[PDB]
C-alpha cells in the first residue's frame, strides 16, 4: 500500500517512498470567519469568530 484513504475518498496518509515510513496527511488549518458587529451605526468595533 502506497497512499491511504479515509471513509471518504480523500487521502489521509502516504508512505514515504525513500524512508518507507507512514505519514498522516492533514489539510492545513482552515475554517469560517464570522464577524460580530454591533452595527456600523453604533460603532466600527468588531469581534471575530
Amino acid at each position: 500500500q502506497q497512499f491511504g484513504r479515509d471513509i471518504a475518498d480523500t487521502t489521509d496518509a502516504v508512505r514515504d517512498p525513500q524512508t518507507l515510513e507512514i505519514l498522516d496527511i492533514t489539510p492545513c488549518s482552515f475554517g469560517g470567519v464570522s464577524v460580530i458587529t454591533p452595527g456600523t451605526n453604533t460603532s466600527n468595533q468588531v469581534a471575530v469568530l
Binding site: 479515509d6 471513509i7 471518504a8 480523500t10 489521509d12
Partner: peptide
Amino acid sequence: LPDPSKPSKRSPIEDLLFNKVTRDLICAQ
C-alpha cells in the same frame, strides 16, 4: 425530575433518551 447527582442534571428518562439517540466522518466532511 432533574437528577442533581449526575453532571448533566438531566432526568433519568432524559438520560436514557440521550443514550438511545445517536479519520471520522465529521473530520472528512
